[PDB]
Amino acid sequence: ATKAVCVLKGDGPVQGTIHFEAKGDTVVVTGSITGLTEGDHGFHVHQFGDNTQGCTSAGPHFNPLSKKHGGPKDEERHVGDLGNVTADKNGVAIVDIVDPLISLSGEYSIIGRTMVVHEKPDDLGRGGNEESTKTGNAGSRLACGVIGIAK
């Protein structure tokens, strides 16, 4: 697939639509999320496209290379580590990410996995506690969706 899409939903007001496109040798991620508190929010690809228990069943961050959590610019990071999206005072975060580890086909494919946006900022694996090395202390999952093949 060369295009994918994800519709985020949760128990609260946060929602959004995320688009993915394979361009060149990389993946361009665009879209928007609304209903967020002003500021930074962790944003990652989780391993399972399973919404049977809400966002909890998506599992941990997608991590096929078995590394510790980091920011998108770090060598030591999970494949799903897309950092933070930033919401303005109106609650809107415009997503604009280009990422070198995710893909839409093959081993690194995120098709069928889940995008999650979190309650708190991702500390990029630099918080200094064990949780930082797993999730960046991004906290609860406000909304998520399964990543599907788009036309």
Q: Is 61 in the site for Zn ion (CB under 5 A)?
A: yes
Query: Is 126 in the active site?
Result: no
Residue with tokens 């998108």: 72
Q: Is 81 in the site for Zn ion (CB under 5 A)?
A: yes
Q: What separation, in Å, do the N-terminal and C-terminal C-alpha atoms of the chain show? A: 9
Letters for 24-53 (x = contact with its own copies by CB under 8 A, - = none) are -----------------------xxxxxx-
Cα distances from 151 to residues 2, 5, 8, 26, 76, in angstroms, run 9, 9, 18, 18, 33
- Tally Cβ neighbours within 10 Å of residue 65: 12
Choosing from 41, 61, 77, 113, which is the catalytic residue?
61
- Tally Cβ neighbours within 10 Å of residue 44: 31
Binding site feature residues for Zn(2+):
61, 69, 78, 81
Annotated catalytic residues are 44, 46, 61, 69, 78, 81, 118, 141
Binding site feature residues:
44, 46, 61, 69, 78, 81, 118
Q: Which residues bind its own copies (CB under 8 A)?
A: 1, 4-5, 7, 17, 47-52, 59, 111-114, 145-151
